[PDB]
From TrEMBL, chains A, B:
Other information: All late proteins expressed from the major late promoter are produced by alternative splicing and alternative polyadenylation of the same gene giving rise to non-overlapping ORFs. A leader sequence is present in the N-terminus of all these mRNAs and is recognized by the viral shutoff protein to provide expression although conventional translation via ribosome scanning from the cap has been shut off in the host cell.
Family membership: Belongs to the adenoviridae hexon protein family.
Role this protein plays: Major capsid protein that self-associates to form 240 hexon trimers, each in the shape of a hexagon, building most of the pseudo T=25 capsid. Assembled into trimeric units with the help of the chaperone shutoff protein. Transported by pre-protein VI to the nucleus where it associates with other structural proteins to form an empty capsid. Might be involved, through its interaction with host dyneins, in the intracellular microtubule-dependent transport of incoming viral capsid to the nucleus.
Highest taxon in the source lineage: Viruses
UniProt-annotated location(s): Host nucleus; Virion
Oligomeric form and interacting partners: Homotrimer. Interacts with the capsid vertex protein; this interaction binds the peripentonal hexons to the neighboring penton base. Interacts with the hexon-linking protein; this interaction tethers the hexons surrounding the penton to those situated in the central plate of the facet. Interacts with the hexon-interlacing protein; this interaction lashes the hexons together. Interacts with host dyneins DYNC1LI1 and DYNC1I2; this interaction might be involved in intracellular microtubule-dependent transport of incoming viral capsid.
Coiled-coil boundaries: none
Protein's name in the database: Hexon protein
Amino acid sequence: QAVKTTAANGDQGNTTWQKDSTFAERNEIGVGNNFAMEINLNANLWRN
Amino acid sequence: QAVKTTAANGDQGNTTWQKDSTFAERNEIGVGNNFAMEINLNANLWRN
C-alpha cells in the first residue's frame, strides 16, 4: 500500500499519511532476489 | 465434487442433484495451463 509524508515541520518523519487518493491499495511488490532453480548442463549431456 | 442435472421441467438448471452415489467426493482437477519454469538453453552453453 502507498504512503506519503505530512507537512513535515519537525521530527514529523514519523507522521506518515495514506496516499490512497493517487495509488491503489493492493499493489504487488517482491523483496530480494527472484525465485530460481539451478541445473548443471554439460554434466548431463556427457552423462547421457 | 461431482454433480448431476435434474429432470429439467423448465428453467430447472438451478435444480442440480449431487451424484455422490457414483463419483467420490474429492476428485482432483487442475484449471488452466500447468506450472512451467523457463530457461534459455543455447545462450548458457555459449556463455559457459
